mmCIF file of C-alpha atoms (C1' of nucleotides) and ligand atoms in Angstrom:
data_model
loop_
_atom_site.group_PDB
_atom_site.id
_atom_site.type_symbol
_atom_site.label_atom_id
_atom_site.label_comp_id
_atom_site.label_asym_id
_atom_site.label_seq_id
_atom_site.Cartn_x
_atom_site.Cartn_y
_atom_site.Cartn_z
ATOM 1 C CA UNK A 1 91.192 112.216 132.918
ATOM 2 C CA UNK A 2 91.358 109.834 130.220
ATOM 3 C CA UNK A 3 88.478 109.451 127.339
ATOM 4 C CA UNK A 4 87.467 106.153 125.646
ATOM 5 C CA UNK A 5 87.692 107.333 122.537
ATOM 6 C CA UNK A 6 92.088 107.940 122.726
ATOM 7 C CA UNK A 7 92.730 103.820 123.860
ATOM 8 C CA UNK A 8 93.591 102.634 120.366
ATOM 9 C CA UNK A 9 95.705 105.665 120.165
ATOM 10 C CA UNK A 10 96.930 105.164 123.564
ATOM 11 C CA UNK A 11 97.991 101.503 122.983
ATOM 12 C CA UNK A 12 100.467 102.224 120.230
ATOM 13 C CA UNK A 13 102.160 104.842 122.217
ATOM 14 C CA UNK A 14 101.942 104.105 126.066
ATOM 15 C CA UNK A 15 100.625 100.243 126.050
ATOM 16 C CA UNK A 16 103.322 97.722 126.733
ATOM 17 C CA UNK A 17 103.947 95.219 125.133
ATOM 18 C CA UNK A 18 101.679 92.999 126.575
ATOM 19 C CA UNK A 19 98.764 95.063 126.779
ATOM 20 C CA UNK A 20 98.932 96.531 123.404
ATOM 21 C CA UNK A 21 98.678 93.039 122.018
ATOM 22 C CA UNK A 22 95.561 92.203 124.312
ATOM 23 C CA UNK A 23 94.167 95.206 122.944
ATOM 24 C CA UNK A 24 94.168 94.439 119.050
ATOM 25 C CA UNK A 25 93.516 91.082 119.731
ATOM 26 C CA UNK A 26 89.947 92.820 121.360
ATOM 27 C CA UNK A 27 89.224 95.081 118.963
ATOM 28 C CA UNK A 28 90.016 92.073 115.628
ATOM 29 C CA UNK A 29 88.261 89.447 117.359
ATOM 30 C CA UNK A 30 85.640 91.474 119.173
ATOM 31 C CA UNK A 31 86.147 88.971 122.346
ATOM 32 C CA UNK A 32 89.014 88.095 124.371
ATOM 33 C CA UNK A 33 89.576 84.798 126.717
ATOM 34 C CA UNK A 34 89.584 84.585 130.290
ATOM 35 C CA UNK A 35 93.015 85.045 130.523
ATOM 36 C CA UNK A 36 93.245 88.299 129.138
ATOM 37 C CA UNK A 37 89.991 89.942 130.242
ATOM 38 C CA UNK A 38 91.758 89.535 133.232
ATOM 39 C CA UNK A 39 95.367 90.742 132.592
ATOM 40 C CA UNK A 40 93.576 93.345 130.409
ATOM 41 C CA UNK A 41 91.125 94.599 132.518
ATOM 42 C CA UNK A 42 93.008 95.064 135.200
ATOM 43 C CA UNK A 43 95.301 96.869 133.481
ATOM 44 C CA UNK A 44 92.564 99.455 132.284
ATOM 45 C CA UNK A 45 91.400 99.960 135.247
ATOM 46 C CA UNK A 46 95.241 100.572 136.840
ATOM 47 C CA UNK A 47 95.110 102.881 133.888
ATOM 48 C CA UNK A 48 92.306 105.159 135.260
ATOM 49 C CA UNK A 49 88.974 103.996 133.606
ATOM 50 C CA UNK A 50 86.394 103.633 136.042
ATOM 51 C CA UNK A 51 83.719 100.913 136.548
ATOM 52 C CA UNK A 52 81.372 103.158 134.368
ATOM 53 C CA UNK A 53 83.719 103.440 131.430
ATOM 54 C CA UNK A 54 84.871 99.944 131.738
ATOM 55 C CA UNK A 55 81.552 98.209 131.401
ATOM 56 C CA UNK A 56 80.736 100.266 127.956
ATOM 57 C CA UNK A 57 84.260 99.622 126.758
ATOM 58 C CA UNK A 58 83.433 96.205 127.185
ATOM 59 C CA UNK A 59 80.016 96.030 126.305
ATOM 60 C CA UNK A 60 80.967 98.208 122.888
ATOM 61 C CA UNK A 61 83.280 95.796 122.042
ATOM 62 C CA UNK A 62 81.585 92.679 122.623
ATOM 63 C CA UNK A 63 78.402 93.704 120.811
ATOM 64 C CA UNK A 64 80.307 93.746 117.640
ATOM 65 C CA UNK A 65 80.976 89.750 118.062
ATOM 66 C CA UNK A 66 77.112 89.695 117.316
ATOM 67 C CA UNK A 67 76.193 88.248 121.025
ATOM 68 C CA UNK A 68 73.507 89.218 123.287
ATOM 69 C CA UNK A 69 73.881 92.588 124.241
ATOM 70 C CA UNK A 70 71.509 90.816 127.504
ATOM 71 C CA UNK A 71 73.509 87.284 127.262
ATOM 72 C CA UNK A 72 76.323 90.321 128.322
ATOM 73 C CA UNK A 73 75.013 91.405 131.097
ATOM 74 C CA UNK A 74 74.175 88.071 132.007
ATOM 75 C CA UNK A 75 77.537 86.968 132.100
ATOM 76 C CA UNK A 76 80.422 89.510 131.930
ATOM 77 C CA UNK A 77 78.735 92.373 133.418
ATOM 78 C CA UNK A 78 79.005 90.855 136.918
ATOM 79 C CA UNK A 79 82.714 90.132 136.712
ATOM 80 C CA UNK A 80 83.556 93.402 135.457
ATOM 81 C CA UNK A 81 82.036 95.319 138.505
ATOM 82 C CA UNK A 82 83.847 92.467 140.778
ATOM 83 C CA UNK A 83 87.615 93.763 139.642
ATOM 84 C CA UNK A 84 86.424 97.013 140.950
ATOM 85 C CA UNK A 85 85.462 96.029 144.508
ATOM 86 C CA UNK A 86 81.633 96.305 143.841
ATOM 87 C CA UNK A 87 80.826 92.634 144.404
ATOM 88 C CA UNK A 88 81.032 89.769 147.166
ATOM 89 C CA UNK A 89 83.507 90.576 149.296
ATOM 90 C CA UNK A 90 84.404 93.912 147.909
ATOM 91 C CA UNK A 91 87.819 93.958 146.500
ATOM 92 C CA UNK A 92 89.521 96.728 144.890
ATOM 93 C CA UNK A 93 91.999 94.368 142.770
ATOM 94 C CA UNK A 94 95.709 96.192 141.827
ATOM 95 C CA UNK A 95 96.943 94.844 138.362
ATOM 96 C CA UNK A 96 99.041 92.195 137.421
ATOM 97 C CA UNK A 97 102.574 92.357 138.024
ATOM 98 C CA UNK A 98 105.133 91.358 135.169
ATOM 99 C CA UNK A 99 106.728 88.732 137.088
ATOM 100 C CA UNK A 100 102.873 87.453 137.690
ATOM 101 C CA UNK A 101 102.320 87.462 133.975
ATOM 102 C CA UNK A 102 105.827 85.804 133.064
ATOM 103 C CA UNK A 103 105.950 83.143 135.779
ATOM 104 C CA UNK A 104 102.094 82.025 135.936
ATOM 105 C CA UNK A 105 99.134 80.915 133.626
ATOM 106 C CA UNK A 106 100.923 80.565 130.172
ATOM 107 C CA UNK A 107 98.901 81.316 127.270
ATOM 108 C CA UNK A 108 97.297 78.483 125.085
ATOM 109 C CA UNK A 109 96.126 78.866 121.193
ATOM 110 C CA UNK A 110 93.529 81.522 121.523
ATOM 111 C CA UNK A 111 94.829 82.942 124.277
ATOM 112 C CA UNK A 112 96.349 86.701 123.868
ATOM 113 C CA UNK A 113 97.878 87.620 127.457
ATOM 114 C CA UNK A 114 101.335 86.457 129.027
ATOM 115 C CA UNK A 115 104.431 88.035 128.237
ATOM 116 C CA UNK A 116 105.777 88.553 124.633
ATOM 117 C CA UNK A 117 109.346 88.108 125.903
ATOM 118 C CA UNK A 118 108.636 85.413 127.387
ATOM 119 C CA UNK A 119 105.449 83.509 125.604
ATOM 120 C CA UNK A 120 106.085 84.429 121.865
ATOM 121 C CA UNK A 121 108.435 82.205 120.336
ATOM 122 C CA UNK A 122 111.642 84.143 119.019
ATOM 123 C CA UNK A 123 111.001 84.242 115.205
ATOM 124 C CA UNK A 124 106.661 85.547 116.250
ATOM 125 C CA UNK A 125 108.254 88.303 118.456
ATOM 126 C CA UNK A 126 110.553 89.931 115.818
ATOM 127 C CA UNK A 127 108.029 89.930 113.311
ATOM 128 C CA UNK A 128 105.744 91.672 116.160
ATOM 129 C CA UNK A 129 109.113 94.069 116.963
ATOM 130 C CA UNK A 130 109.281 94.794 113.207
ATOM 131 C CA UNK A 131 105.186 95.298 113.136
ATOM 132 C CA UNK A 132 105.417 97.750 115.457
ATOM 133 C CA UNK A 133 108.638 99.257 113.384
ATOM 134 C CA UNK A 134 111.560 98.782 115.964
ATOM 135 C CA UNK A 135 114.703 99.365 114.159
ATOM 136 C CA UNK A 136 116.487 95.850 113.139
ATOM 137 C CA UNK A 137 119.353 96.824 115.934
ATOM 138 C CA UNK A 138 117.616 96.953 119.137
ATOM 139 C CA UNK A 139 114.974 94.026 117.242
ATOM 140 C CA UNK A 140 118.585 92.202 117.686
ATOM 141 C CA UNK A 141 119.393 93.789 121.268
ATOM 142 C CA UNK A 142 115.951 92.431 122.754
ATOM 143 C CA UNK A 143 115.662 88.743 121.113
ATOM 144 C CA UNK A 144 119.528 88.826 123.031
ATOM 145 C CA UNK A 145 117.892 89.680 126.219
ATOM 146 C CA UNK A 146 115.026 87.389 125.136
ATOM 147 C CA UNK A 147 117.399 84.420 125.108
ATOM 148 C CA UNK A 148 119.158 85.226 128.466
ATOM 149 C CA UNK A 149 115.257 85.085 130.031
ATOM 150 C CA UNK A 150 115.668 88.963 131.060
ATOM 151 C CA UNK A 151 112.167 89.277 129.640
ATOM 152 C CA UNK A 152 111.751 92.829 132.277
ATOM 153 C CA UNK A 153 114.698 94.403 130.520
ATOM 154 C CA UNK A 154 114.115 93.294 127.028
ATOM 155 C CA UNK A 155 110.834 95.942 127.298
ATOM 156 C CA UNK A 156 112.771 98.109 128.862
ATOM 157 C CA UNK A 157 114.502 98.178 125.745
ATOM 158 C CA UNK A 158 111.346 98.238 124.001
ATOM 159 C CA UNK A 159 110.367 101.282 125.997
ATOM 160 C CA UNK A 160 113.294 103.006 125.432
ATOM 161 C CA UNK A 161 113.366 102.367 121.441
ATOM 162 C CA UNK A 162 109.444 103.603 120.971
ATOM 163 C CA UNK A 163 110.214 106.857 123.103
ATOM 164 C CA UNK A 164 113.193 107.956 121.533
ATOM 165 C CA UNK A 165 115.119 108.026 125.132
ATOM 166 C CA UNK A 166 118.907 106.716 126.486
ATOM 167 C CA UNK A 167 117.909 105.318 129.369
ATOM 168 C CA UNK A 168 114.243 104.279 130.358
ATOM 169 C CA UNK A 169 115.315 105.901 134.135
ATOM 170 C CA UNK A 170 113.688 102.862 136.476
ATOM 171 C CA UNK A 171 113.455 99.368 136.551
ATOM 172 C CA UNK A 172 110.270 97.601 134.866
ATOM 173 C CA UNK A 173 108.509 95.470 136.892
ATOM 174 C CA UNK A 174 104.395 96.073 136.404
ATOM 175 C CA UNK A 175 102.851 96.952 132.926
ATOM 176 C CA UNK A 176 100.925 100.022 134.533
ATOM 177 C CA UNK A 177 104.483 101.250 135.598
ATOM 178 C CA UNK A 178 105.266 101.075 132.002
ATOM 179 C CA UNK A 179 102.585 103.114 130.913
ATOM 180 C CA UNK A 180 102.756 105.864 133.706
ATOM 181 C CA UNK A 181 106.773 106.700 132.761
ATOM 182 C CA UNK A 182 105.200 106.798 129.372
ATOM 183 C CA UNK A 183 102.736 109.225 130.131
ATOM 184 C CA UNK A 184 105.620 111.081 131.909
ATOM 185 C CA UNK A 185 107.670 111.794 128.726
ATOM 186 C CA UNK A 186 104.976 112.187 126.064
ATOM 187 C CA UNK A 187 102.436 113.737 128.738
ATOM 188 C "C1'" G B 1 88.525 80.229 133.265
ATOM 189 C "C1'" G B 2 87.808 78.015 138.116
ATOM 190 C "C1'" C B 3 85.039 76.798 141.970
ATOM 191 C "C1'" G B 4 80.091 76.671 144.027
ATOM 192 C "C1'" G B 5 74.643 76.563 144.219
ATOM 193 C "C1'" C B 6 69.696 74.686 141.727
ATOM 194 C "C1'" DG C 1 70.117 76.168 131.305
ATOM 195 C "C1'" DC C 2 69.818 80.025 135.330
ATOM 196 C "C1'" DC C 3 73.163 82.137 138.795
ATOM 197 C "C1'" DG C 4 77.357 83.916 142.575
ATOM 198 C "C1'" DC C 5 82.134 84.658 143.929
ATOM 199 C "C1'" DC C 6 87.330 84.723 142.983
ATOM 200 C "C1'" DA C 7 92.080 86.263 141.592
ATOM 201 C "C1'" DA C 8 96.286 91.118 142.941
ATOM 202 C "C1'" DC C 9 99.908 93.257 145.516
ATOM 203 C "C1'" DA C 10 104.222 98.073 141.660
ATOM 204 C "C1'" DT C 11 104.278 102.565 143.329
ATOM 205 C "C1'" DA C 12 107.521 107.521 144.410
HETATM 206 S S1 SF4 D 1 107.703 93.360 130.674
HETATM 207 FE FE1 SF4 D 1 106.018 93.173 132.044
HETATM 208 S S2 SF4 D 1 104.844 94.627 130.894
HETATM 209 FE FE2 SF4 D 1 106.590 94.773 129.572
HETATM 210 S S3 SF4 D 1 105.487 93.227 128.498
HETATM 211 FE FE3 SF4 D 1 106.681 91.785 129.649
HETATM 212 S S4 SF4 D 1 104.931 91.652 130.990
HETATM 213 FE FE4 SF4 D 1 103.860 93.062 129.881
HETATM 214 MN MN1 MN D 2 82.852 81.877 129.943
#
RNA sequence: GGCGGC
DNA sequence: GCCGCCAACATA
């Protein structure tokens, strides 16, 4: 049910986080490392894209970095259509998890995906909170929860700050969970 | 990115 | 240089 055309969109008001970073790192840079064509990718698909959509997105995307659109296919194409199930052994892989993301492969220098709670450095994460114009009080609430390592919550908190909401209602534990309870309220 | 093949 | 095959796991 969902169009291309509305991600961007999308990321600013249903993206978590996490994902929402991954995206503008994509659409600034064109390209995006292992790491987060995985986390990423994943994510879009848990979203609802399907393997046709997701190779254009993709594609699109990548053309702009000046490559191959053929040294793309070469390449990327293949592992693309694998996250869906439609190579070697056939796999239809579910998303990342948070604790997944917060627990395993930290992010290097280039690197975009991880957890912000958890792999942005205190004083980079407020200036991201502030980017994305979270008012100064929860800003404060979530580095709090930030420094007691309750990453999970700290979004929460995010979630509940960008939707204008008390109480989130459930307890955050996958970034495509995040997104559906945000489709909920503004869908 | 890793592993694997030439 | 060409290429194949993997990983995940919430979830009402
Ligand atoms: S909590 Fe889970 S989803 Fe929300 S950002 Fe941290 S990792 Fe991505
Ligand atoms: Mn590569």
């Amino acid at each position: 049910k969902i169009s291309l055309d509305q991600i961007d969109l999308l990321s600013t008001k249903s993206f978590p986080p996490c994902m929402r970073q991954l995206h503008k790192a994509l659409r600034e840079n064109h390209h995006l490392r292992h790491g987060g064509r995985m986390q990423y990718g994943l994510f879009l698909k848990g979203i609802g894209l399907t393997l046709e959509q997701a190779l254009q997105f993709w594609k699109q995307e990548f053309i702009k970095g000046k490559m191959d659109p053929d040294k793309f296919d070469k390449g990327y194409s293949y592992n693309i259509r694998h996250s869906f199930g439609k190579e070697g052994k056939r796999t239809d892989y579910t998303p990342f998890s948070c604790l997944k993301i917060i627990l395993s492969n930290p992010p290097s220098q280039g690197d975009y995906h991880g957890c912000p709670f958890r792999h942005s450095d205190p004083e980079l994460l407020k200036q991201k909170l502030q980017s994305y114009k979270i008012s100064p009080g929860g800003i404060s609430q979530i580095l709090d929860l930030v420094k007691g390592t309750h990453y999970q919550v700290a979004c929460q908190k995010y979630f509940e700050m960008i939707h204008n909401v008390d109480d989130c209602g459930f307890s955050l534990n996958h970034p495509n969970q995040f997104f559906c309870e945000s489709q909920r309220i503004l869908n």
